Amino acid sequence: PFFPPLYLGGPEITTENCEREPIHIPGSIQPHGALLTADGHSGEVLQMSLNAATFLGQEPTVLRGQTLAALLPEQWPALQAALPPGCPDALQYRATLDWPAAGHLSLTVHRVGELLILEFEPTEPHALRNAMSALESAPNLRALAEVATQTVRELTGFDRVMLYKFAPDATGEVIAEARREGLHAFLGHRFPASDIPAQARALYTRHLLRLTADTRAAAVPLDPVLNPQTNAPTPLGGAVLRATSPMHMQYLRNMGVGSSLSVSVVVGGQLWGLIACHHQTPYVLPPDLRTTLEYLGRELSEQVQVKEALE
Ligand SMILES: *C/C=C1/C(=C/c2[nH]c(/C=C3[NH+]=C(/C=C4\NC(=O)C(C=C)=C4C)C(C)=C\3CCC(=O)O)c(CCC(=O)O)c2C)NC(=O)[C@H]1C
């Protein structure tokens, strides 16, 4: 059973209670983007990341309480029709914005209950179809693993891309990797289950991609921290901008990893493994490339089942 989050008087997490961290409700985001929450009916902005005003070039006093009708006149009607009350929380509305203060922005919106969760990130399929085909054309499980890591590395430029496979006891093993010259091998190395604790593995079965763009960057809180609709935490399990567990951030820093990203491989409704990526320098993977990775994760998941059937 989860501890209360830090902003509800909960304790800072230690190695004695890894699995009790409520990672889905950190009440804060990573600073490379901005997040707003809004009422699902009225479009009233209910919460904003502390950096939202500066990030969007808006006046802090104007942004809170303002409506999505006023802030996003060209998207609001499309947004409403796309995400009606009761829709699956995995369902997304995406748009590209031309925003003077921040340049081209990717907007990603989801609904949870009566709340809309809006993520703004800077933004800039021939390669995708080729990548899809390379996975399918892979002859066996090992080659599929190898092609997957190589293809993901080519698409992303990440210093290391691993296929990290979970054993029945939830320990992990790197079973394939593609790596930059000079990086030491993790191939064949195994890791305790506690390195990716049970509540993370659970979240990763439902929300299939997560990342930390800068492992040294302080989280940016949401204000107000609680959803005013409910006087309860804002569900951020489906927000890629959500803050990463400090326990994990520390693990990455100690490994010399500045940027981390993984994609779930789900086989038969169970978490089979992860496409796990590292960069030494902080690194924001373009929003369009993340969508490509999401498609490739789905393809790999299908192909792992197919290839395991071949034996
Ligand atoms: C006491 C808690 C601990 C803890 C928590 C923790 N770890 C994660 C997430 C991940 N851990 C990963 C581990 C590895 N990455 C690697 O490259 C290797 C080995 C080469 C390992 C073992 C991975 C891949 C993740 C997924 C996230 C990612 O891809 O960056 C979480 C959940 C983080 C979040 O989503 O907010 C948590 C709470 N890890 C520990 O070691 C202990 C201290």
Question: Tokens 């400090």 correspond to what residue?
Answer: 246
Distance CA 182, CA 200 (A): 31
Residue type, 232: A
Domains, the chain, ordered by start = 1-122+216-244 (3.30.450.20), 123-215+245-311 (3.30.450.40)
Documented resolution in Å: 1.7
Apex CA 122: angle with CA 119 and CA 128, to 5°? 95
Q: How far is CA 209 from CA 18, 65, 260, in A?
A: 20, 31, 11
Q: Are 86 and 75 in contact (CB under 8 A)?
A: no
Ligand 1 pocket test, candidate residues 149, 248, 264, 280, most atoms within 8 A of CB: 248
The reply to whether ligand 1 has any atom less than 6 angstroms from the CB of 2 is no
For 247, the token pair is 């326990």
Buried b (16+ CB within 10 A) or exposed e, 63-92: bbebebeebbeebbeebbebbeeeeebeee
Query: Do β-strands 190-191 and 172-179 pair in parallel, antiparallel, or remain unpaired?
Result: antiparallel
What does the radius of gyration of the chain's CA atoms come to, in whole angstroms? 20
Distance CA 305, CA 310 (A): 9
Distance CA 94, CA 82 (A): 10
- Cis peptide bond upstream of 5, omega within 30: no
Apex CA 246: angle with CA 264 and CA 209, to 5°? 15
Question: Tokens 């080519």 correspond to what residue?
Answer: 154
Distance CA 127, CA 148 (A): 14
Distance between Cα 255 and ligand 1 center (Å): 11
- What DSSP designation does 21 have? -
Question: Tokens 């901005």 correspond to what residue?
Answer: 34
Handedness of CA 269, 81, 31, 235 (dihedral sign): negative
- Please, which experimental method was used? X-ray
- For ligand 1, atom 1, name the residue with the nearest CA: 18
* Nearest alpha carbon to residue 19 among 239, 221, 233, 245: 245
Residue 87 is labelled as binding a ligand: no
